[PDB]
Amino acid sequence: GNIVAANLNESYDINTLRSKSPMQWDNSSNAGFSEASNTWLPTNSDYHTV
Numbered sequence: 874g875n876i877v878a879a880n881l882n883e884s885y886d887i888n889t890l891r892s893k894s895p896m897q898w899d900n901s902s903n904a905g906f907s908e909a910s911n912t913w914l915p916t917n918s919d920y921h922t923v
């Protein structure tokens with residue numbers, strides 16, 4: 874699903890940022906997309922079940 878668009882300090886169209894959320898692999902931190910502390914966009918919060 875879409876995410877609620879946070880503000881980025883890079884120039885992005887926030888009307889379309891909802892569809893560019895990171896891919897949801899296994900239920901780790903950042904849904905297995907990264908092992909960093911924070912990603913460039915927030916992961917959707919339903920990644921434990923989806």
Ligand SMILES: *[C@@H]1O[C@H](CO)[C@@H](O[C@@H]2O[C@H](CO)[C@@H](O)[C@H](O)[C@H]2NC(C)=O)[C@H](O)[C@H]1NC(C)=O
Nearest residue numbers: 878879880881882883884910911912913914915
């Ligand atoms: C743009 O990025 C963040 C917000 O997305 C700005 O704020 C910093 O965010 C980091 C992330 O944890 C904090 O640790 C800092 O305390 C924040 N404040 C700072 C660095 O003053 C960040 O400032 C912005 N960067 C720009 C405008 O270059």
